[PDB]
Write a protein that binds this ligand. Structure first.
Ligand SMILES: [Mg+2]
Ligand SMILES: [Zn+2]
Ligand SMILES: [Zn+2]
Ligand SMILES: [Zn+2]
Ligand SMILES: [Zn+2]
Ligand SMILES: [Zn+2]
Lengths: 299, 49, 110, 45, 112, 46, 85, 49, 180
RNA sequence: AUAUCA
């Protein structure tokens, strides 16, 4: 819209919703009189009416981004209904029904996220990653239970939900090298800090320990003390340093068990970091019990 | 027979959350006849209320 | 407002109820309606020559209403047709149809 | 006792006030002992 | 009446399709879009139609056709009236029954 | 000077910006408040 | 697009009014946009029939971590004519 | 507000023919169509311009 | 600079032109392995140049392990002579180098994450999966494995110049992302 | 849909 009388390039116009008019703010000419409430109009599509009494409720919302435009009701039981005609009209929908059934692979993603404790924004990215790569010739014939296992880490890597590839190896399934190549052909079409909360919780450490481990691990990387060790190992090692520094300790066996790393490996990172333990700790860390920097195992 | 794949937690979790929230005491987002108003928001106008 | 039309302004004096002859339904229609797709020319932002405005009514603060133009606050919206594969009963008559069969010969139509 | 599973994995206790403010649910975990036995016979025991 | 209402005109052969004003759509935010229950019910009629047309054209299996016809019969019928005695209601995903045309005119709060 | 947000329980000031992490420094609790405007408000004493 | 005729000046650059500012009808408490393409206005204005001073404003994330903000507005209602007792 | 059925009745009782027409038209709903003289339908493609 | 990549492995193919009886080949060769159940080829070896050959029934042969193009052709002719000596009507034809691998050391540590962010469309870096950055060069079409240590691997070349070309092209980039 | 208002 632009005022026919004035015409200034930045067309300064207001929507006086309350009087249901669209006005030109300069000359005051009314540019439109019919004006509709979009909130209440949207209430007619997505309501709270599941019973069926609302006369205002007359439509339904859909998702054109995920399921395209497939409008379709379902034959079901009503108040006055014979259980015979429901069966026939449903047995008649069976002859009219392959790819309109591969949408049940969304039910595979939804049941995987809920088994992996994943948010509602991750499922919808995993379902959009799967819809745009399951019929690709670039994926061709990859393990069909390992291409949807790869599109879940694609949806997590945008929704900022920290999930290692070994965390999705535990869910399903994953063949490592098989869902690692598939996680790249689709990509063409974590850190220390990520694990620390969970590992610490299982460890049963206090916030103080978590924060310091978190600070050490970052510094370890910043310092580049651990050249190429896996972040999981770095984190487990840092957790070892901080915890040992505090009162409630945790052993390598226990840390490794939670981090799902091996003591030997944690040892490997730990000793690399130990030399710069001083630099690593948070500045206002309070070593307690009897574990000061000098005394830390050093192992 | 992977356990995590077998038991769907969301079944009972969101199944109760639905009832308590909306108030249609039944399963689930496909409710009728279900009895609406079983669960409702607590009046906090006055203490007696 | 709502713009001027040279057409004579008159009042409705009689209302003549009736049923739609399929010939007429076809004759009024301004679009064929071939596809169960709303709009989305496959992931797009325009109506599909198939369901709502295949040639039909206009919405979305945009004139395009088949020559008619005008747009929303003038266009009444014009009908499309759908050609059914086999005859079906109009639910409302189903009984008047039944009664008519009950009155006439199911072979000669007398 | 009532708990909450935050976005960053960590689970911790949850008091009624935090529930009302962060619009959470004041719920606790349900855990059940499960056992999976296996049996076999040839062509009653 | 020979002019305005011949009995041959009671059985539906062609279906007048109402324009958007009668069944408004709303385009929210590119991943949210709302269509009217009629637009849903129509799409089912169409889908059921396109199906039965292909069946007759192809090798007509008699009993697999009349099976698809009485599906079409249902969708067309349930679109004008969803509150039919004896028949199952057409439902819309959320469990709520489709607002048929009859039902928009009917009650107090109806169009009348 | 300047306290962008305050803590709900421990009442320690926070002063954080966009994408800094919605949590308090020492205590966990993601609650956090807003702290009054420096644009002093005047009221009629009636 | 489609901005509210109300005023947006009381918003700090985080899109919120700081607590203590006095508000009034049609004024914008919470500034929001729903980018789609540049972007439409999805802001929250104070009810047009009311007014008062902002009491408290809190910023949080929820069960899945969606940033969401609650704004409290305080008024003092002094017995008027049609007031029931 | 709703000038409902019972209000229509009072106006009909008063004999306020033009006051009623106004409430129902000018004060609400009122619209203009072009109809055909042969088949009294809203079919007319009014390219009024 | 001053660094020039060292060739580490050359893979070549040769058509012998006649069908072979693998049990016979394996039996008569001085340094052969043959287990039909594991792989369908005789794995034959010679001491000079030190190489390994995969010999098929079709008469096709793959020769690998050489450090120079000269050594590759030399060892290939030698394998062909062995087949002849065993009695088949083999011919040394279609010698073609299919892959050349090279490596070097730039002598400084590299910031792989920075490089991956900067050269995102050519890079692939998942340190938990594999510690090196996989860089897919357009011209020449060579794949480089880049490590934090500064050690570099170049592969996918059909000609030696491509190995040399790619390194020359990558060096400025490695310098831009150094640690000390 | 609940609660409520005369
Ligand atoms: Mg009274
Ligand atoms: Zn103007
Ligand atoms: Zn028109
Ligand atoms: Zn007869
Ligand atoms: Zn605090
Ligand atoms: Zn006409």
């Amino acid at each position: 819209l632009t005022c026919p009388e004035c015409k200034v390039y930045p067309p300064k116009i207001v929507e006086r919703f309350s009087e249901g008019d669209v006005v030109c703010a300069l000359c005051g000419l009314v540019l439109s009189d019919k004006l509709v409430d979009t909130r209440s109009e949207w209430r007619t599509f997505s309501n709270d009416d599941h019973n069926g009494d609302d006369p205002s409720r007359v439509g339904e919302a859909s998702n054109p981004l995920l399921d395209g435009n497939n409008l379709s009701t379902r034959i079901g039981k009503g108040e006055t209904t014979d259980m015979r005609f429901t069966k026939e009209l449903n047995k008649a929908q069976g002859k009219n029904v392959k790819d309109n059934e591969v949408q049940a692979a969304f039910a595979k993603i939804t049941m995987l996220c809920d088994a992996a404790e994943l948010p509602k924004i991750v499922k919808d990215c995993a379902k959009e990653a799967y819809k745009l790569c399951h019929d690709e010739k670039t994926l061709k014939g990859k393990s069909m239970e390992s291409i949807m296992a790869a599109s879940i880490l694609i949806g997590c890597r945008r929704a900022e939900v920290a999930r290692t590839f070994k965390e999705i190896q535990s869910l399903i399934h994953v063949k490592t090298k098989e869902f690692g190549k598939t996680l790249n052909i689709m990509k063409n079409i974590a850190q220390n800090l990520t694990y620390i909360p969970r590992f610490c919780s299982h460890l049963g450490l206090p916030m103080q320990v978590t924060t310091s481990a978190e600070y050490t691990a970052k510094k370890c990387k910043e310092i580049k003390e651990i050249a190429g060790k896996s972040p999981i190992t770095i984190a487990v090692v840092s957790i070892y340093l901080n915890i040992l520094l505090f009162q409630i300790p945790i052993t390598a066996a226990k840390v490794g068990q939670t981090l799902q790393v091996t003591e030997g490996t944690i040892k490997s990172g730990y000793k690399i970091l130990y030399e710069h333990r001083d630099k690593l700790v948070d500045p206002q860390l309070i070593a307690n019990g009897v574990v000061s920097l000098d005394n830390l195992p050093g192992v | 027979f992977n356990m995590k794949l077998a038991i769907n937690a969301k079944t009972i979790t969101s199944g109760l959350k639905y009832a308590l929230a909306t108030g249609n005491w039944g399963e689930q987002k496909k409710a009728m006849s279900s009895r609406a108003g079983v669960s409702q928001v607590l009046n906090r106008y006055t203490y007696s209320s | 407002g709502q713009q001027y039309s040279s057409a004579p302004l008159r009042t409705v004096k009689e209302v003549q109820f009736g049923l739609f002859s399929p010939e007429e339904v076809r004759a009024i229609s301004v679009a064929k309606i071939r596809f169960p797709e709303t709009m989305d020319e496959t992931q797009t932002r325009a109506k599909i020559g198939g369901l709502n405005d295949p040639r039909l009514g206009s919405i979305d603060r945009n004139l395009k209403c088949q020559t008619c133009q005008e747009g929303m606050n003038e266009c009444p919206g014009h009908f499309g047709h759908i050609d059914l594969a086999k005859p079906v009963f109009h639910v409302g008559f189903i009984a008047k149809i039944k009664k008519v069969c009950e009155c006439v010969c199911m072979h000669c139509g007398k | 006792k009532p708990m909450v599973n935050e976005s960053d994995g960590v689970t911790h206790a949850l008091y009624p006030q935090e529930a009302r403010l962060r619009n959470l649910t004041y719920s606790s975990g349900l855990f059940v002992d499960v056992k999976k036995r296996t049996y076999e016979a040839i062509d009653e025991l | 009446n020979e002019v305005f209402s011949r009995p041959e005109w009671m059985i539906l052969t062609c279906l007048p399709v109402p324009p958007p004003p009668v069944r408004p759509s709303i385009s929210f935010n590119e991943s949210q879009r709302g269509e009217d229950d009629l637009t849903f019910k129509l799409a089912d009629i169409l889908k059921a139609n396109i199906s039965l047309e292909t069946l007759e054209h192809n090798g007509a299996p008699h009993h697999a056709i009349e099976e698809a016809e009485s599906l079409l019969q249902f969708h067309v019928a349930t679109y004008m009236d969803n509150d039919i005695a004896g028949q199952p209601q057409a439902l819309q995903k959320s469990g709520r029954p489709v607002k048929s045309i009859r039902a928009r005119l009917k009650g107090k709060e109806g169009r009348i | 000077a300047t306290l962008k947000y305050i803590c709900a329980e421990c009442s320690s000031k926070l002063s954080l910006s966009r994408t800094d992490a919605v949590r308090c420094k020492d205590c966990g609790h993601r609650i956090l408040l807003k702290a009054r405007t420096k644009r002093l408000v005047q009221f009629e004493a009636r | 697009l489609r901005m509210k005729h109300g005023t947006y000046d009381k918003l700090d650059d985080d899109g919120l009014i700081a607590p203590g500012v006095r508000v009034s009808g049609e004024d914008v408490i919470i500034g929001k946009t729903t980018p789609i393409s540049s972007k439409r206005d999805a802001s929250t204005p104070l009810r047009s029939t009311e007014n008062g001073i902002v009491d408290q404003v809190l910023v949080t994330t929820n069960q899945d971590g969606l940033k969401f903000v609650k704004v409290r507005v305080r008024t003092t209602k002094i017995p008027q004519i049609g007031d029931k007792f | 507000l709703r000038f409902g059925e019972m209000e229509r009745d009072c106006m009909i009782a008063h004999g306020a023919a033009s006051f009623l027409k106004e409430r129902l038209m000018e004060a609400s709903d009122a619209f203009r169509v072009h109809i055909c003289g042969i088949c009294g339908l809203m079919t007319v493609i009014a390219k009024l311009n | 600079s001053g660094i020039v990549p060292t060739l580490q492995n050359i893979v070549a193919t040769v058509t012998l032109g006649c069908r072979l009886d693998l049990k016979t080949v394996a039996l008569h060769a001085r340094n052969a392995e043959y287990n039909p159940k594991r792989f369908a080829a005789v794995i034959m070896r010679i001491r000079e140049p030190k190489t390994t050959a995969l010999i098929f029934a079709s008469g096709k042969m793959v020769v690998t392990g050489a450090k120079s193009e000269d050594d590759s052709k030399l060892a290939s002719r030698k394998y062909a002579r062995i087949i002849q000596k065993i009695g088949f009507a083999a011919k040394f034809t279609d010698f073609k180098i299919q892959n050349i691998v090279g490596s070097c050391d730039v002598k400084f540590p590299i910031r792989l994450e920075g490089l991956a962010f900067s050269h995102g469309t050519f890079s692939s870096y998942e340190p938990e999966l594999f510690p090196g950055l996989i860089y897919r060069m357009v011209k020449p079409k060579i794949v480089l494995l880049i490590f934090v240590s500064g050690k570099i691997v170049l592969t996918g070349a059909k000609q030696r110049e491509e190995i040399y070309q790619a390194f020359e092209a990558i060096y400025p980039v490695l310098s831009e992302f150094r640690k000390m």
